[PDB]
Design a protein around this ligand. Sequence first.
Ligand SMILES: COc1cc2cc(OC)c1OCCCOC[C@@H](C)OC(=O)[C@@H]1CCCCN1C(=O)[C@H]2C1CCCCC1
Length: 128
Amino acid sequence: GAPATVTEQGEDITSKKDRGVLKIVKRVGNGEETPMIGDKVYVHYKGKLSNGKKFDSSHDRNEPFVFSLGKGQVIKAWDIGVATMKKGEIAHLLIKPEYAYGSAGSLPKIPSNATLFFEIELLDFKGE
Ligand SMILES: COc1cc2cc(OC)c1OCCCOC[C@@H](C)OC(=O)[C@@H]1CCCCN1C(=O)[C@H]2C1CCCCC1
């Protein structure tokens, strides 16, 4: 499935090159602006534990997920990965614990040392 494909074929978009955040572009977006730190960002996403064992969707809330990039609202891997996307792009991210919830986890949703998978569509972004 998608998580294994990203392991095998994803690009390492970390500064450290530690394969902490692996990305595949699944649908190409438009323009060549990508969101800058501070931007108000609008996405739809489907996410789960690597393990397949918990699953989560923006669609569950019936509404886009909105956050300021690099403002510690989301895990480090989102600040990193969404910043590489173009408006209208869909990407797959596979994320090691260090770029997500770490060895502490976030119970009961997220266990210790959890690898996470997301599909993200970038809908839009606007300057602060
Ligand atoms: C750890 O708590 C949650 C994690 C997720 C969804 C949650 O609710 C819909 C959630 O609890 C409510 C807090 C809202 O704040 C989410 C923020 C921390 O989340 C994140 O940084 C990331 C990226 C933005 C989308 C939500 N992300 C999650 O980690 C989800 C996970 C995804 C894997 C399956 C379990 C939920």
